[PDB]
Amino acid sequence: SDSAYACDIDATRYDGFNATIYEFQPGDGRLTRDPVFMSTGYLNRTQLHSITGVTDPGFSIYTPGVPTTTLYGIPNVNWENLLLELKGYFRAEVSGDYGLSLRNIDDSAILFFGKETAFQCCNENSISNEASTDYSLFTIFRQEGDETTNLDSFTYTQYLEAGKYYPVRTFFVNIERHAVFNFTMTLPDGTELTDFHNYIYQFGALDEEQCQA
Ligand SMILES: [Ca+2]
Ligand SMILES: [Mg+2]
Ligand SMILES: [Mg+2]
């Protein structure tokens, strides 16, 4: 009720993020700075692929000469012009400070945390943002010189309560050449994990009795 972030869910759970690839269109590089497109506008694009069960989402790709790759078990994915969304329920094992990090992103990524900005507790497809400041993290790779790597890293930390579920939604864009999406989590003791296994979860359809916010 007054949690403003957390869901209470009593249902069979499944490991992993839901990953969805959207249709890149020419000129989307200019939209990586657009607060409408990066929050909900991309949901107007055709969904090309959808899978579930991703617990280790980070990747770094650059293979000139071969423009496609296998991403999360999806074959023939264009990694140079990529629109990628992750959605899942983050579950705290203990009460304490958990972190979510986006490191050296190329080209751009945005992170929404909590039921008011990521998605609705009982409907992962119910997504709407109220303002352009709803995000928890936003990063874009701007050439700060002669370097080939984004030197910026971002971390969102929040005190979470044990047993509760927190909606998490990311959107990642690669415009050209290198694709770097390094998305990690941090435990209250400071341990940084690249694999979200046992912390990121999915549910099927949820009734009013199994889901409360
Ligand atoms: Ca790039
Ligand atoms: Mg398991
Ligand atoms: Mg336990």
Residue numbers in the entry: 41 to 253
Give me lines lifted from the publication on this model.
In general, they harbor an N-terminal A domain that is followed by a region carrying a highly variable number of serine/threonine-rich tandem repeats (B region). The A domain that is crucial for adhesion comprises the binding site, which, in the case of PA14 domain-related adhesins, recognizes disaccharidic ends of glycans in a C-type lectin-like manner. Binding is achieved via a Ca2+-ion being complexed by a unique DcisD motif and further amino acid residues in two calcium binding loops (CBL1, CBL2). In this study, we mined the genomes of ascomycetous fungi for hitherto unknown PA14/Flo5-like adhesin domains and identified such domains in several putative GPI-CWP adhesins of methylotrophic yeasts from the Komagataella genus.
